[PDB]
Amino acid sequence: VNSFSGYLKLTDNVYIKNADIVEEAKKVKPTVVVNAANVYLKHGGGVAGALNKATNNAMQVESDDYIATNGPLKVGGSCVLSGHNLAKHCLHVVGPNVNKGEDIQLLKSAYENFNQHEVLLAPLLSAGIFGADPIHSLRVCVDTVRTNVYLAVFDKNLYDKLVSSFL
Numbered sequence: 001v002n003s004f005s006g007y008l009k010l011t012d013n014v015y016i017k018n019a020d021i022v023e024e025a026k027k028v029k030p031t032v033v034v035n036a037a038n039v040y041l042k043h044g045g046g047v048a049g050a051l052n053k054a055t056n057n058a059m060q061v062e063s064d065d066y067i068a069t070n071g072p073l074k075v076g077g078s079c080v081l082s083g084h085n086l087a088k089h090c091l092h093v094v095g096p097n098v099n100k101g102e103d104i105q106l107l108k109s110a111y112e113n114f115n116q117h118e119v120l121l122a123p124l125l126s127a128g129i130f131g132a133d134p135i136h137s138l139r140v141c142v143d144t145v146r147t148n149v150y151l152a153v154f155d156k157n158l159y160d161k162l163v164s165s166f167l
């Protein structure tokens, strides 16, 4: 049993809810929250800007030190950093950004990072301002992640479309 409430069960391991991931993280304090990161860990907008704002910019300060030491992530890659006031850990995952011309085949590689964690609170990778089709992102998630993933979908309209169209 875990603390996640109000989710619709899609599969054995994937759950979905219309929720603000920031407000969900603040309520649950999950072991892992996933950030929709870019390779520079520049948390300007979308999910990353919202998560970082909720940490009072402490996520960005930590991230800048990580990049200064290690250099940029790979598209499809990840790193584990602090979850600050939102979670124990933040798994920063880089899905491909369609609005930069990145290979959508890298979305499966991105979701494979989730398999290193038994339970996660996450957004749909490459959705929103990363430009991918969220229906596609949900299909790749279900077909790739084997650990228990609780997806927070920001748009009520999109949430209802993802559920209604789910095979």
Ligand SMILES: Nc1nc2ccc(Cl)cc2s1
Pocket (backbone or CB within 6 Å): 019, 020, 021, 022, 023, 045, 046, 047, 050, 127, 128, 129, 154
């Ligand atoms: N407080 C939140 N801000 C955002 C911004 C973009 C997306 Cl895709 C989800 C969320 S939840």
